[PDB]
Design an enzyme around this catalytic site. Structure first.
Site, PDB file in Angstrom:
ATOM      1  N   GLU A  54      -7.232  10.257  -3.295  1.00 17.17           N
ATOM      2  CA  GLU A  54      -8.524  10.752  -3.292  1.00 17.17           C
ATOM      3  C   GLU A  54      -9.233  11.360  -2.152  1.00 17.17           C
ATOM      4  O   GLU A  54      -9.601  12.352  -1.873  1.00 17.17           O
ATOM      5  CB  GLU A  54      -9.509   9.949  -4.008  1.00 17.17           C
ATOM      6  CG  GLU A  54      -9.082   9.524  -5.476  1.00 17.17           C
ATOM      7  CD  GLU A  54      -8.297   8.438  -5.681  1.00 17.17           C
ATOM      8  OE1 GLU A  54      -7.486   8.081  -4.771  1.00 17.17           O
ATOM      9  OE2 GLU A  54      -9.058   7.388  -6.444  1.00 17.17           O
ATOM     10  N   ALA A 291      27.273 -12.941 -12.305  1.00 16.42           N
ATOM     11  CA  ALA A 291      27.388 -13.055 -13.676  1.00 16.42           C
ATOM     12  C   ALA A 291      26.527 -14.099 -14.002  1.00 16.42           C
ATOM     13  O   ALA A 291      25.629 -14.020 -15.280  1.00 16.42           O
ATOM     14  CB  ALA A 291      28.616 -12.990 -14.377  1.00 16.42           C
TER      15      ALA A 291
HETATM   16 ZN   LIG Z   1      -9.204   4.481  -3.959  1.00 15.09          ZN
END
Ligand SMILES: [Zn+2]
Ligand SMILES: [Zn+2]
Lengths: 356, 357
Positions: A54, A291
């Site tokens: 952001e 395994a």
């Molecule tokens: Zn953030």
């Protein structure tokens, strides 16, 4: 118009993928800003400690962010962490709307970013391309919501379900393209788990050394977790090359302390996974083990996804079984849902999810 | 771009040749287009043995206009009176200017003789155009005609850990129905499906073609079912016998079998059996649908051209029955393949594999 939203989210989903090897323990997040149907800001999260997607997108947007629509693959955070709250940055940037793919998976914080956004009189939409967006953070979303890591198990076998003639020979049935693919799985993993047997037999490293078009130094390396209950790990093992990225479950050993190896207490497999998540913030685990340990993980239901490499060879009936369980009835089979199969030169790879 | 023009038209012919894949055997799949002034004027494929050849159909459509045209045909036009007249003669009669041929026909009844018939009439012949693509249309026939050995596809189905049943022998629903339906395709292009007696007793399998996606099953030229039964344990009530005329049994002579109309084959080694199916019974494509032992013997004897492997997304464990039951002591002994491709069939995958030899 929902289709418009979905288009923009997909872009954010694509940007999110750009930090895939370098973000852990932080999630992969992407963000686009759209003003008047125009892309005006792009951001992804590159690395824990760095700005969130952001922030990077709003920087690009500038004063133009005002009245714009932000699309983010994960709910904008509301809490100071290493960095400030994105919810607030979006309030400051005076956007009109926020479109979110994944709510925050941490139930203590889910909706907090939305709440800030909605109180600033910013409209909010959640769930758009959620399914796709959630593919960017399988470990993260799982660990934040359940306290357990997403666990992937790597297995390499022949057409006839076998892995070796004899043990400790270090022979390969799979090719180099499959080696290359394993690197991707390691590079998105916070830890690679194996058992001391593999280490002794193979002097394996279980680190990330080559990914096309990415330099090693940018990669947030998985921790190497060794299950070594009798403490037979030799100090000469290549894996101990970078001791700070090694964890060892087994008896306390002073020699391992002196190297700075993280020493884990002996604990059930399930508890080990919990400890990795809670104490070490490891949310994606990869198993690359023989395994016994592979079978144990599968039989204890600890595998979210099996990544199975199949080499076009038959080893015959007396060769080592990929899976150690002794089932008596067909009703006891461990069935999986197949996600996809791809070709890797001569080998194929299946990704398989447990069903119930 | 003459070469490009030719490849375009041949690719058309190759598409027609995919139209009777299930119905042609023992005859080859063959496509033919006729092109005049770059206009497609005639089209044909061979639908079924005994019915006219692609060429005839293509020529019939073209009519008078075939004169001066270029015929594109995926296999050398035939030269002999067989179940029908020779096509090279027909091309000569229609007065085509040119015949472009993908594959030579190694059928000793043809083998260059169609080409020669055309050259002798002053028709230009070009050969080899999209040969590799066209060859894919008759893997069996071309192999059989030129070597006397059929093309042999080995079908196996297994769990991810390479197992085909529990130690008890319980085995129901490992692979799912899309895989089962894919097997229908393999059966339908095969001249014979070979299984061992053990499979017949255990499964009471039929190994015929009963359904095919979007195809009228009446068009299918049914495979023969070949049962290896060294000791003649085949019960007369076995479902595989309800259509005796299409069953062959390799075992001791039984008059009760002869009376049902079952072909009885002499006990012989597998390689020889395969040659027998080719040279005596015109079976050029073979599908093996057998248990571990018979399957492994065909593999280890080097008798498989292609393995078709269906893998279910499930684990049956280390005590379940192995799909391949050789025991190798050393890694160097491993049986290697080249992968042609892998596809997803709902929840199963299918691998096609070519032995490395
Ligand atoms: Zn953030
Ligand atoms: Zn003909």
């Amino acid at each position: 118009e929902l289709k418009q939203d979905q288009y923009w989210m997909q872009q954010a989903i694509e940007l999110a993928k750009r930090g895939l090897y370098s973000t852990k323990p932080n999630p992969n997040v992407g963000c686009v800003i759209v003003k008047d149907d125009q892309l005006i800001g792009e951001g992804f999260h590159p690395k824990a400690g760095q700005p969130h997607a952001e922030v990077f997108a709003l920087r690009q947007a500038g004063e133009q962010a005002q009245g714009a629509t932000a699309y983010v693959t994960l709910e904008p955070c509301a809490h100071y962490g290493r960095t400030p709250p994105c919810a607030e940055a979006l309030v400051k940037a005076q956007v009109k709307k926020v479109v979110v793919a994944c709510p925050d998976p941490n139930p203590l914080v889910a909706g907090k970013g939305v709440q800030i956004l909605k109180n600033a009189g910013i409209e909010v939409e959640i769930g758009i391309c959620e399914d796709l967006a959630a593919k960017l953070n399988q470990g993260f979303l799982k660990a934040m919501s359940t306290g357990m890591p997403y666990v992937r198990l790597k297995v390499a076998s022949s057409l006839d379900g076998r892995t070796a003639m004899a043990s400790g020979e270090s022979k390969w049935i799979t090719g180099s393209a499959a080696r290359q693919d394993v690197q991707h799985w390691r590079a998105i993993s916070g830890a690679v788990i194996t058992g001391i047997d593999t280490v002794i037999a193979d002097d394996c490293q279980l680190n990330v050394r080559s990914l096309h078009n990415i330099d090693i130094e940018t990669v947030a390396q998985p921790k190497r977790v060794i299950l070594d209950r009798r403490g037979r790990l030799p100090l000469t093992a290549k894996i101990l090359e970078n001791p700070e990225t090694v964890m060892v479950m087994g008896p306390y050993r002073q020699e391992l302390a002196d190297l700075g190896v993280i020493q884990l207490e002996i604990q059930p497999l399930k508890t080990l996974l919990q400890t990795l998540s809670k104490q070490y913030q490891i949310y994606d685990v990869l198993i690359e083990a023989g395994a016994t340990l592979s079978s144990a993980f599968l039989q204890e239901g600890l595998i979210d996804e099996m990544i199975s490499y199949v080499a076009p060879t038959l080893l015959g009936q007396s060769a080592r079984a990929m899976f150690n369980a002794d089932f008596e009835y067909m009703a006891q089979q461990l069935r999986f849902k197949l996600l996809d199969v791809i070709q890797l030169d001569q080998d194929i790879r299946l990704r398989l999810i447990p069903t119930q």
